[PDB]
Design a protein around this ligand. Structure first.
Ligand SMILES: COc1ccc2c(c1)cc(C(=O)NS(=O)(=O)c1nnc(NC(C)=O)s1)n2CC(=O)O
Ligand SMILES: COc1ccc2c(c1)cc(C(=O)NS(=O)(=O)c1nnc(NC(C)=O)s1)n2CC(=O)O
Ligand SMILES: COc1ccc2c(c1)cc(C(=O)NS(=O)(=O)c1nnc(NC(C)=O)s1)n2CC(=O)O
Lengths: 274, 286
């Protein structure tokens, strides 16, 4: 049967998985490289940074998915203003026509850090990311480094299941004072918003303290967190770039999570030791 | 990698078969995958023949004894391995690609991300082997991603496995058609199996009771479900040294729905240490 209509240079919106699959296949056959930016809508400047990263690949056609995963006019207007040509907006029923059945089970990393208090959270994410990859079949898929544990788990999924996509991590877009962009930032009252800059300040202080070794980096970040009121730290850990044990010197990642009132915030940063 | 058309080309490295497959697909060939654990018999050859019949096909047969689907034990070590006979049979059938990866190339990081099947994996064969089908679907997903076939071929003999594979394909939006091929049988009705070689002469004589029980049931079924089950039970009971593990009549999808007009009757039984499975389509009142 017929490929659904695709109008080059305009925003084309599809909610049926088979439709975007068919258009994506047709476009790839035409000499486009299909770039996927998965989102849950309510798009912000961090999402736009993913889009801009994707658009600049020569030959790109950009697919932005908007799917709120149980396990609008404004969004489309922003994507049109960015020159995005495909929005994929499926219903929960289209994604899960047989309900919850076969799912992805992450490796033991999912049980650490964010996976601590609820060991099935990343299973939901990795399941939908796998489905979006198979539907759209992109050459590259773009995520922010903000949810870094998530991002490492997606790289694990791609390696472990032999998937033919490149995973591109885009540096986290931040507010002017360093706070990492987040849908949750608008819930902070002004005292909480002022205190919240300690997460990014702690991590940047650590990244610079790290010429003096790992202990100095951790101690500098802890002192900065300790200078902030109402910031209940859930963890502060230095790991290697794959989230295993930090090697004695070399590259790592420093991750923090804290609760301010009812709002949980996360941040992370690249660390080079000595 | 080199690909010599009309000859059997053997690749161990996943990257080799993936590149060859992609190159053939881009030039118009349709890639057919038949995933096996080796020890090939005529039942496997029927899969290969179904694949070859597809116009313009190139057939890739994988042979990999997947450690993730064995629970035990010496079950893994005990699995039959006959790779010389296997490659000889593939050459005779005109297969152009065999994919024979190492365990290290499939699982370089060990068990890490895996497929978790839905609730059907804990029933029937999965009841006492709760991780068996996660091992199967994890390997089948990986072979599908490596080879990217148009169609993949499985026997109906492991019917529960086939249904789980259809679930994997639907649930992860995989772009591959699953083809189920009817069970090839010996002249007496015995389902072909790599495991039939572990039947001694007495047990091989007795083993005809599984298929005899199932066909008796499929004919009895005009008189309803109880008659079909009782006919199969009667045949299994008349058989020396057959220990029935389960005999169950389910809807065709084996899912959370009652039997209607179409059923699958499944049997598992032990002859000494050898566990045999068989199944058949059943039409009730009809
Ligand atoms: C390049 O800079 C950035 C900076 C922040 C970003 C992003 C990019 C992308 C997001 C983001 O969360 N997008 S999302 O809602 O589609 C998600 N992606 N993964 C999520 N995981 C969970 C567990 O919700 S939510 N966020 C955070 C946020 O919106 O809350
Ligand atoms: C306007 O001039 C060009 C021309 C080519 C470009 C770009 C710009 C940008 C990219 C590109 O790779 N962008 S990206 O965001 O997908 C990546 N950045 N790093 C990547 N890979 C790794 C391993 O870090 S992918 N590329 C394609 C490339 O570099 O492969
Ligand atoms: C069309 O006719 C048939 C008939 C029987 C078949 C086949 C084809 C294929 C097989 C077979 O075992 N295929 S396999 O190597 O990919 C396996 N599939 N599931 C397996 N499960 C276990 C527990 O060994 S082994 N088998 C059954 C077998 O070897 O027991």
């Amino acid at each position: 049967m017929a490929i659904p209509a695709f109008h080059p240079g305009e925003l084309n919106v599809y909610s049926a998985p088979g439709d975007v699959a068919d258009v994506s296949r047709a476009l790839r056959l035409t000499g486009r490289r299909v770039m996927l930016v998965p989102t849950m809508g309510a798009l912000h400047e961090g999402h736009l940074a993913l889009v801009r990263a994707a658009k600049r690949v020569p030959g790109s056609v950009v697919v932005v998915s908007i799917f709120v995963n149980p396990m609008p006019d404004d969004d489309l207007a922003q994507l049109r203003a960015e020159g995005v040509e495909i929005a994929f907006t499926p219903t929960t029923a289209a994604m899960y026509p047989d309900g919850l059945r076969t799912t992805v089970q992450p490796g033991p990393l999912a049980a650490e850090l964010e996976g601590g208090p609820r060991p099935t959270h990343f299973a939901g994410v990795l399941t939908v990311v796998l489905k979006l990859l198979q539907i759209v079949r992109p050459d590259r898929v773009f995520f922010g480094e903000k949810d870094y544990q998530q991002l490492v788990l997606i790289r694990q999924l791609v390696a472990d299941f032999n998937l033919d996509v490149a995973v591109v991590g885009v540096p986290t877009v931040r507010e002017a004072d360093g706070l990492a962009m987040s849908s949750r930032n608008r819930y902070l009252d002004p005292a909480q918003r002022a205190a919240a800059v300690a997460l990014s300040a702690a991590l940047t202080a650590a990244a610079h303290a790290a010429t003096a070794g790992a202990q100095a980096a951790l101690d500098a970040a802890r002192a900065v967190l300790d200078a902030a009121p109402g910031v209940a730290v859930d963890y502060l850990e230095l790991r290697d770039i794959g989230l295993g044990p930090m090697p004695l010197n070399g590259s790592g990642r420093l991750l923090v999570a804290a609760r301010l009132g009812t709002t949980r915030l996360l941040d992370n940063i690249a660390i080079e030791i000595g």
